[PDB]
């Protein structure tokens with residue numbers, strides 16, 4: 001199945017919805033759609049690609065960096081997050097990552 005993922009970031013002037021397969025990570029999907037999101041490790045051990053899930057469910061079980069509390073507030077490491085429903089995500093949340 002494919003899901004619609006809305007990406008938001010005012011500063012970067014981004015507010016677009018993309019359609020991606022459920023086996024595609026949020027970051028890869030954005031990249032193939034011309035949306036350049038930050039990343040470093042691409043392996044789940046850094047804060048570079050962090051986003052915040054505003055609405056919807058995702059799977060980021062391969063992540064390592066974030067803790068339960070962070071995850072609970074909706075933060076997700078986009079390089080290892082797959083959509084489980086249509087969702088809305090704010091990008092570039094690294095500075096806000098407490």
Ligand code: FES
Pocket residue numbers: 038039040041042043044045046047048049050065077078079080
């Ligand atoms: S780029 Fe490092 S965790 Fe995603």
